[PDB]
């Protein structure tokens, strides 16, 4: 029927003065734009059909043509930034916000989807959707006693669209918009659906990627325990945004970091530091490096949970980017730890894998390792056992590397390497 129409035929039917002929053509346009193989988006745009589709959004007496045009515009707005702009330039934004209150649920859901694609383009369109007043009617669709009474797909689109309203930086979303969304966002974070949980964590992930004032706004709502629960989930699409939000929170103040520790987050890191996914292992190591940059009683809590051997292991064998994050974790550990905490780091076997990474073809990891060695030697002086540590570095072949790092391109590497061999001779 409406299968495999030409663009010329679609134009001929939409330009007729017959609402049912226009409905037939719009459906044929929707079917073209919903094919997997190269949807002719640019061809439809050049034909001048976007303004006609936008007007069809307002024909309340013919809901089938509201739905077909919203679907067609949804898919145009899913392409490039130039194609999303054509949808916006046609006046689609206020029309989709009006459709949010449609008594037909499949039409309201389609307006949510279209507004999600518009806001996902970037900061500008995101704020423009907010200025047109989309948040109030969006949150009204979720003001029910139990979210389980809503349709699964209806709820997944609402969570996804909302997350796109929390997304992107330069600038971040308006503070008032974030404060207005968070209570509903926290409720979604306790829902049972896997996709709702994943997209809710991504939203919290975005809101925590910024200054400490943004982090505190989230922490104040008490979502940190629930983030730790999801951090130990089985589903990979949930663990990934959950860890990102935890890692974001520990970039802030020591008090905000301590709330992550109090919720039991460190108990999950034996698994996270041995996760078979390279990206989970790296982000977990990065998070550990920001935790060892805190107070001494926090470094001690890292020790108590037994995570120092896991850092030794990651330093011993992992993807090179994960290894560098582990080198940072050690240098932060050594620069802010006590004497008892620095020697315990040696008793766990940090020295050998730390020396073996001095053969890396990277200058920054060399500087980080060498500065860690300096802080370790400084603690050996305080005890008067520098001889033992220098012997330890020589026996494993670390001295050969340190002295080979003399003849290095970078000046800073040479100076630190020399200063080390002059003070302790190994």
């Amino acid at each position: 029927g409406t299968v495999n129409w030409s663009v010329e035929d679609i134009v001929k039917g939409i330009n007729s003065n017959n609402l049912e002929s226009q409905l037939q053509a719009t459906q044929a346009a929707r079917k073209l734009l919903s094919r997997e193989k190269q949807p002719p988006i640019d061809n439809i745009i050049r034909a001048g059909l976007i303004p006609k589709f936008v007007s069809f959004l307002g024909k309340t007496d013919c809901s089938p043509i509201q739905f077909e045009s919203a679907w067609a515009l949804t898919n145009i707005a899913s392409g490039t930034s130039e194609q999303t702009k054509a949808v916006v330039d046609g006046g689609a934004i206020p029309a989709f916000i009006s459709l949010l209150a449609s008594p037909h649920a499949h039409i309201s859901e389609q307006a949510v989807w279209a507004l999600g694609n518009i806001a996902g383009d970037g900061s500008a369109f995101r704020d423009l959707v907010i200025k047109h007043g989309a948040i109030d009617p969006l949150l009204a669709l979720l003001a029910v006693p139990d979210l389980s009474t809503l349709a699964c797909g209806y709820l997944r689109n609402l969570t996804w669209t909302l997350s796109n309203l929390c997304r992107n930086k330069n600038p971040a979303p308006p503070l008032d918009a974030v404060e207005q969304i968070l209570p509903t966002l926290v409720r979604l974070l306790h829902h049972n659906d896997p996709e709702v949980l994943a997209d809710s964590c991504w939203a919290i992930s975005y809101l925590t990627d910024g200054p400490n004032e943004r982090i505190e706004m989230v922490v104040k709502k008490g979502v940190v325990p629930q983030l730790v629960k999801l951090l130990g989930a089985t589903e990979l699409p949930i663990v990934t945004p959950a860890l990102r939000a935890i890692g974001n929170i520990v970039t802030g103040t020591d008090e905000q970091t301590q709330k992550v520790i109090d919720a039991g987050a460190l108990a999950v890191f034996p698994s996270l530091l041995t996760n078979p996914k390279t990206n989970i292992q790296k982000e977990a190591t990065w998070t550990m490096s920001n935790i060892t940059a805190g107070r001494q009683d926090q470094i001690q809590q890292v020790v108590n949970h037994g995570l120092v051997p896991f850092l030794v292991g990651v330093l011993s064998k992992a993807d090179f980017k994960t290894q560098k994050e582990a080198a940072w974790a050690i240098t932060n550990y050594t620069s802010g730890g006590t004497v008892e905490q620095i020697v315990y780091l040696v008793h766990c076997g940090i020295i050998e894998p730390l020396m073996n990474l001095l053969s890396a073809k990277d200058t920054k990891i060399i500087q980080v390792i060498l500065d860690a060695i300096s802080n370790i030697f400084q603690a050996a002086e305080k005890l008067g056992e520098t001889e033992k540590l220098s012997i330890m570095i020589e026996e494993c072949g670390g001295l050969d590397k340190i002295e080979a790092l003399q003849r290095h391109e970078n000046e800073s590497v040479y100076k630190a390497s020399l200063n080390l061999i002059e003070k302790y001779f190994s």
Binding site: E36, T74, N75, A77, W113, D121, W160, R167, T251, A293
Partner: peptide, 13 residues
């Protein structure tokens, strides 16, 4: 110091 260092669009078929 501390060191500070998912589809945007969906098509309906």
């Amino acid at each position: 110091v501390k060191r500070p260092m998912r589809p945007r669009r969906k098509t309906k078929t």
